[PDB]
């Protein structure tokens, strides 16, 4: 019998993981503040990493990598990509991005905006989306909290029939040994209302968030296109597979991002151990080029895929450390 704790009740993924663990009969749940655990399913804010691995005669494991917030915050991701030579300013899969504080790189932001202004090419930026620099800067200071200004993808990939926009979510599990496992199933969180090149004020067609959409559910159920259908569409429309056109770049970006932060976060020689599930968010343009949007520390799965992913988490992240009495993941080798 192995023991675990649950410290994030709001986590829809790990509520299912604990449910599956109890069902085997070889795992018992303890109270939130019981320090005599094998596994921690910790909280999102202020996780006590300093308290792990100090309890004698217990192997301890947690579902979060300490330090991995440096990849999962919008301000942190830009700072990491710009400073780390493994990514370099010249990164090509990440959109041109700048960090602005409200009351810093404000002079660096306007220097590149002027080159775009003089050349008169596509000059639209996301933070609310606008074409004017001084109109966005006044709205950041109006909010309060610190946010990032990023180059908006003015030439996205269309979906037919519909002339639509989309983002791809891929689920990635990093185990205790720093193996990177990409889940074979992803989701296309689609827009239902057609893309409008002229009117940026409208946000329902430009932003592909699952909350904003809820023409919801016209083309596919709950604005969610799964990997078999999207592969089929690409074969018919563009004469290509998802594997070649998109997935190779996705596999490259995940691997490049996590290899960069390996020496800072790895629990290979530590007193305690860590695994973590990540949500990588991608944007495909008209030329079939893949761009990284955001990384998610506490990602939520789609309804169809909860059962399979959560069982897979138990298989290679939990039972690999605590064994019991086909693989759904593609390993990204390094």
């Amino acid at each position: 019998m192995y023991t675990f704790v649950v410290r994030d009740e709001n986590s829809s993924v790990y509520a299912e993981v604990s449910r599956l663990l109890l069902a085997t009969g070889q795992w018992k749940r303890l109270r939130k503040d019981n320090p005599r655990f094998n596994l921690m399913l910790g909280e999102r804010n202020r996780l006590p990493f300093g308290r792990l691995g100090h309890e004698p005669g217990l192997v301890q494991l947690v579902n979060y990598y300490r330090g991995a917030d440096k990849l999962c915050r919008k301000a942190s991701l830009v700072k990491l990509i710009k400073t780390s030579p493994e990514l370099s300013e010249s990164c090509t899969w990440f959109p041109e991005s700048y960090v602005i504080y409200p009351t810093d790189e404000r002079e660096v932001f306007l220097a590149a905006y002027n080159r775009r202004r003089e050349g008169r090419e596509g000059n639209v930026w996301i933070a609310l989306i606008s074409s004017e620099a001084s109109e966005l800067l006044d709205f950041i200071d109006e909010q309060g909290q610190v946010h990032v200004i990023q180059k908006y993808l003015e030439k996205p990939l269309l979906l037919e029939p519909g002339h639509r926009k989309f983002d791809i979510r891929s689920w990635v599990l990093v185990d205790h040994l720093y193996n990177i496992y990409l889940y074979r199933e992803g989701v296309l969180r689609t827009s239902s209302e057609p893309y409008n090149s002229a009117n940026f004020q409208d946000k329902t067609c430009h932003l592909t968030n699952h909350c904003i959409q809820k023409n919801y559910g016209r083309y596919e159920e709950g604005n969610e296109m799964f990997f078999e259908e999207f592969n089929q569409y690409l074969m018919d429309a563009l004469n290509t597979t998802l594997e070649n056109s998109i997935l190779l770049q996705i596999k490259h970006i995940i691997r490049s991002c996590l290899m960069c932060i390996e020496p800072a976060i790895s629990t290979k020689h530590l007193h305690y151990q860590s695994f973590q599930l990540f949500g990588f968010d991608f944007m495909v343009d008209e030329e079939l080029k893949v761009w990284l949007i955001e990384v998610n520390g506490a990602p939520a799965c789609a309804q169809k895929l909860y059962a399979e992913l959560c069982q897979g988490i138990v298989d290679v992240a939990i039972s690999s450390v605590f064994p019991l009495a086909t693989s759904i993941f593609i390993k990204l080798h390094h």
């Binding site: 990493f49 300093g50 308290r51 100090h54 004698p56 020496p263 020689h269 530590l270």
Partner: protein, 437 residues
């Protein structure tokens, strides 16, 4: 030449004192009876070793050391042991009954009855000093004497010796190495009262030393003899610059200068390599590059924490053995590229290096093997606050229900001192927090 007086309080302090002074004698060529054939100036002298040893006309080299315990048992083993002739009886102070794992009993009750006697016997050592610089204090956070009496002594030494520097070697409590339930109380209480009165303090987690003994020496259930002989090796590295000819850490004031910018944040992390088993036949001798790299592994630290998630204020590398500056710089350059070393923005990113050509001396029949080169890193990292957090959480758990508090109150201490001490710790964790992110 300025002199240093070592003070050993409680069981842990006395027993570690035994281990250090054993090692010091083997390093300086001093025999169990106190004779040093290599010393040519008989009856005196202002050599580097005279910081830790005084001399008599007879030719005896006597430690500038005072042993204090509230119970006779442990110091009685010093009085009758193999180094009985080394210390003179006036340096070995014992009481009748111990402080029973109670801070308040050691501080207030039995403390009051023995404080004046101890300071009197300390004053006898200070009188033989031509220029006293200060004190090295060896004690445990856990024990009643080790926590209680120590904090009272540290208070009184600040009054009687106002100018002088004070350094701590403190034993942090671990459930893995025979602890009592009330030791989280004793720890918080003593740290609070001592915080103002200590200039630099070297925490040694019993858990870390236990695991190094298990992993690197193949000792399944490490005794105090095992742990202390290891601790002494680390302590010897730290104090080597005070006992030997050199230009780094030559006096106690330099420990503050090189390691402690923020006066409250005075707990540097010690990291040591290599620990190699004597029972290992055929050993691949480690290079400068390999042993400097081992300083940034948490498995080698005196306190288990993660320096990657935190910031540096200072860094000292102390080498013993076959080491040249060229190899040091070459190792640093490679480590800088491959590891997360983040300094605070108001401090230079750098290392102060001290090399001593004489390799570490091994205790004959001990568990440590002879090595060609060894290093001790002293880094003031905000990561060490993890050990405060752990201890504070345990304090919070018991104190919420006022568990054991009556034992402390029953010795004349107020309940108010508990929360007063805990608030200071909440202040301390926050000081580390502001500096650390």
């Amino acid at each position: 030449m300025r002199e240093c007086i070592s003070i050993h309080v409680g069981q842990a302090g006395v027993q570690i004192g035994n281990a250090c002074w054993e090692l010091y004698c083997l390093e300086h060529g001093i025999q169990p009876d106190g004779q040093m054939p290599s010393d040519k100036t008989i009856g005196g002298g202002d050599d580097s070793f005279n910081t830790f040893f005084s001399e008599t006309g007879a030719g005896k080299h006597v430690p500038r050391a005072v042993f204090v315990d509230l119970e006779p048992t442990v110091i009685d083993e010093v009085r009758t042991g193999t180094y009985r002739q080394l210390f003179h009886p006036e340096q070995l102070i014992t009481g009748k009954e111990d402080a029973a794992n109670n801070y308040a009993r050691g501080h207030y009750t039995i403390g009051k009855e023995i404080i004046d006697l101890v300071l009197d016997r300390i004053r006898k050592l200070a009188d033989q000093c031509t220029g006293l610089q200060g004190f090295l204090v060896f004690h445990s956070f856990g024990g009643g004497t080790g926590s209680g009496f120590t904090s009272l002594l540290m208070e009184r030494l600040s009054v009687d010796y106002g100018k002088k520097s004070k350094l701590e070697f403190s034993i942090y409590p671990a459930p893995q190495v025979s602890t009592a339930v009330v030791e989280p109380y004793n720890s918080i209480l003593t740290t609070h009262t001592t915080l103002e009165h200590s200039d630099c303090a070297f925490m040694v987690d019993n858990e870390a030393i236990y695991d190094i003994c298990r992993r690197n020496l193949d000792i399944e259930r490490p005794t105090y003899t095992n742990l202390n002989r290891l601790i002494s090796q680390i302590v010897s590295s730290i104090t080597a610059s005070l006992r030997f000819d050199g230009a780094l850490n030559v006096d106690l004031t330099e420990f503050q200068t090189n390691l402690v910018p923020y006066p409250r944040i005075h707990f540097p992390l010690a990291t040591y390599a290599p620990v190699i088993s004597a029972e290992k036949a055929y050993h691949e001798q480690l290079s400068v590059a390999e042993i400097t790299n081992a300083c940034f592994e948490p498995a080698n630290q005196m306190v288990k924490c993660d320096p990657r998630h935190g910031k540096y204020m200072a860094c000292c590398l102390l080498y013993r053995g076959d080491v040249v500056p060229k190899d040091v710089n070459a190792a640093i350059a490679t480590i800088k590229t491959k590891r997360s070393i983040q300094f605070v923005d108001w401090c230079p990113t750098g290392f102060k290096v001290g090399i001593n050509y004489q390799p570490p001396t091994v205790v004959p029949g001990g568990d440590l093997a002879k090595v060609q080169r060894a290093v001790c890193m002293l880094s003031n990292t905000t990561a060490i606050a993890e050990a405060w957090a752990r201890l504070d959480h345990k304090f919070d758990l018991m104190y919420a229900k006022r568990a054991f508090v009556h034992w402390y109150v029953g010795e004349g201490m107020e309940e108010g001192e508990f929360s007063e001490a805990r608030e200071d710790m909440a202040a301390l964790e926050k000081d580390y927090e502001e500096v650390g992110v």
